[PDB]
Design a protein around this ligand. Structure first.
Ligand SMILES: Nc1nc(=O)c2ncn([C@@H]3O[C@@H]4COP(=O)(O)O[C@H]5[C@@H](O)[C@H](n6cnc7c(N)ncnc76)O[C@@H]5COP(=O)(O)O[C@@H]3[C@@H]4O)c2[nH]1
Lengths: 177, 177
């Protein structure tokens, strides 16, 4: 299925490559680049999974209580003929009552953008019903993979359907640690 | 199908983003960073499509007459919550009789790595026969998409099955311009 390929590619070409190196990048940030006076960046990669596949490129567009703070040091690797391909991730603060309530590495699962665009291009032969069905199946397959992935406590999938506060959704997952 | 999703994601999340900006990056390279005395980098993105999905990360491993030269200036974009996600491409020289016969931006289609890894992981339920069939279907769907893609003369798909000279394969496509 469409979702089966996208979930395996998200693992093979991304999570399995960056998750083993993420803990070290966060520590390096927390000790060398973070503000001396502010809270540490939390430890896991938080992955947003809107089942409606609405993926703005700016998180502050989805919720103004999610605001960009800084970048981790980037990770590079030679990949499929590209020397020093760059993997970069962004740190966000999460506001509650106008005060910072959390700091974490946060991003949307980019394959949901593919599902959305496929539902929009007639040549893809892919309906909005297909989109919802495959979005769900993508999340479930990714869950399946990560349950047995040796690359373990390194990320958190935040699946949701849409008075909805995305920042409150992330905070609920954050505060479970 | 698996290949249908991977081909649409390769277009939507990569080719359609970098191909409109590639001509300008090559010109900037040719005028500012290229050796003053050497040939210009050719104009299109050459994409290698081994149907056996064997995708080494170092092209010099597939053919010693393909050797890394330099990187284009990188392209950055805000993407799905990642500030300044980096798109980078690498320039290769192509040797014939130990002399340089061409200079071009060259890389493997990374989704073929996903197909290969899926054939190797039992949890993917994906056979080596599936791999060949979907590799072919991935290439054909990508061909279909690009035939009508407004983002036109900007890349060249090099599909091949494996006394085979990869550098000679690329040169044949290069010299058709
Ligand atoms: N958040 C995030 N940051 C990343 O760096 C990243 N890289 C991949 N992904 C997703 O992982 C999966 C596997 O990536 P793969 O490289 O095999 O396919 C990629 C790859 O073949 C190509 N591509 C995209 N960006 C680049 C890039 N910088 N360099 C080379 N190829 C790229 O186009 C495909 C789809 O890209 P994305 O649509 O962004 O989603 C991918 C995909 O779902 C990423 N997701």
């Amino acid at each position: 299925s469409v979702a089966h390929g996208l979930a395996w590619s998200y693992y093979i070409g991304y999570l399995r490559l960056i998750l083993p190196e993420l803990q070290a990048r966060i520590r390096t940030y927390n000790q060398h680049y973070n503000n001396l006076l502010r809270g540490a960046v939390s430890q896991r990669l938080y992955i947003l999974l809107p089942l409606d596949c609405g993926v703005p490129d700016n998180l502050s567009m989805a919720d103004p209580n999610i605001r960009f703070l800084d970048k981790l040091p980037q990770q590079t690797a030679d990949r499929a003929g590209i020397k020093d391909r760059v993997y970069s991730n962004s740190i966000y603060e999460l506001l509650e009552n106008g005060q910072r309530a959390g700091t974490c590495v946060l991003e949307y699962a980019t394959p949901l953008q593919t599902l959305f665009a496929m539902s929009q291009y007639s040549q893809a032969g892919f309906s909005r019903e297909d989109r919802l069905e495959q979005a769900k199946l993508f999340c479930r397959t990714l869950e399946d993979i990560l349950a047995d992935a040796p690359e373990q406590n390194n990320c958190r999938l935040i699946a949701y359907q849409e008075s909805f506060s995305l920042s409150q959704e992330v905070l609920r997952h954050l505060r479970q640690e």
